[PDB]
Structure 1
Amino acid sequence: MDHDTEVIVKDFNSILEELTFNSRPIITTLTKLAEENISCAQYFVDAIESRIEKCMPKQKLYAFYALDSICKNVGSPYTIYFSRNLFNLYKRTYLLVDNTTRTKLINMFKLWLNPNDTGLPLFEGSALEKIEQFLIKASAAALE
């Protein structure tokens, strides 16, 4: 991680640390940084997942909204990287947050099935199937 890379990554991390509520300007700014610095894609992904793992219940959702915005507006390679840990990330988060936050996690998932009316799933079909099965077992989605 050279100089320029370390500067950019450190800045992304500082901005992410201010995401304590549903901030549109911060989410859009992180989205623009992701689109303009694809070379640092992997560090941005690690930063977002670590944030989700370490912060309080409420704040876990907004970090997930940053992930959602980047994946819907920028697309690859972010959609591919996040697909790798999406199930474990979503499940562990769901099991550690309140029920109102859970309905918002559920609606976010629904739009992942048909984003921007494209008719094509946002993430790997497998991750999404596992999440749906988890939701059914948690009485959060209708059985078939």
Structure 2
Amino acid sequence: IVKDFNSILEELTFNSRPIITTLTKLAEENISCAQYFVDAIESRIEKCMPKQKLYAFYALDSICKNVGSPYTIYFSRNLFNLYKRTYLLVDNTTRTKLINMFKLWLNPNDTGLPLFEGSALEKIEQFLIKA
């Protein structure tokens, strides 16, 4: 299950709805493997080329939005640091998209409440203010 999750995630070189939807189902059905999935998405975000890091963030977004706990909690831990580094490594067009994504996280328009609890969102906001 994990190896598949990983290879499908290597093919995420564009904004593929299918792939994202697929990764989201795998995470949803294998809660036992949560963390390995988070591990894998974070690894991808941290290591792939600057211009595809965004799609890995999309996959991260979908899983947290459509599955929720315990992924929201797990992703919370490195959210800010992964977000900051990504922002600093990509072009302005991509930054705009990163920011729109952060806005939905605060006001998921919604069900109405921080998709992420803890300090992650506050830190991102303060970073965006200064940067």
Output the TM-score relative to the length of structure 2.
0.97
3-state DSSP of counterpart to 1:122: coil
Q: CA deviation at 1:115?
A: 1.7
Q: CA deviation at 1:61?
A: 0.1
Q: CA deviation at 1:42?
A: 1.0
3-state DSSP of counterpart to 1:57: coil
Q: CA deviation at 1:131?
A: 0.3
Q: CA deviation at 1:85?
A: 0.6
3-state DSSP of counterpart to 1:116: coil
Q: CA deviation at 1:116?
A: 5.1
* Structure 2: unaligned runs, 5 residues or longer: none
Rg (Cα) greater in structure: 1
Is the CA contact 2:24–2:67 (under 8 Å) kept in the aligned structure 1?
A: yes
| Alignment size in residue pairs | 130
- Give the distance between the partners of 2:129 and 2:108, measured in 1 at CA: 22
4+ aligned runs moved over 3 Å, structure 1 = none
Equivalent position of 2:107 in the other structure: 114
- Give the distance between the partners of 1:83 and 1:62, measured in 2 at CA: 18
Q: CA deviation at 1:24?
A: 0.2
Is the CA contact 2:80–2:124 (under 8 Å) kept in the aligned structure 1?
A: yes
3-state DSSP of counterpart to 2:13: coil
Task: Quote the RMSD (CA, aligned, Å).
Answer: 0.8
Q: CA deviation at 1:107?
A: 0.2
* Structure 1: unaligned runs, 5 residues or longer: 1-7, 138-144
Structure having greater relative contact order (Cα 8 Å, sep ≥ 6) = 2
- Give the distance between the partners of 2:66 and 2:108, measured in 1 at CA: 10
Q: CA deviation at 1:125?
A: 4.2
Deviations 1:104-123 (A, max 9, x none): 00000000012251121100
Deviations 1:39-86 (A, max 9, x none): 101100010001011111111000000000000000000000000010
Identity over aligned pairs, percent: 100
Output the TM-score relative to the length of structure 1.
0.88
